[PDB]
Amino acid sequence: NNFVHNCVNITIKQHTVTTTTKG
Numbered sequence: 001n002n003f004v005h006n007c008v009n010i011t012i013k014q015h016t017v018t019t020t021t022k023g
Helices: 005-012
Strands: none
Touching: none
């Protein structure tokens, strides 16, 4: 999470940063 999710983050535009996330 956070890392690999990064690829997804670029899309989320929050992932990694938030850290906590949720939805």
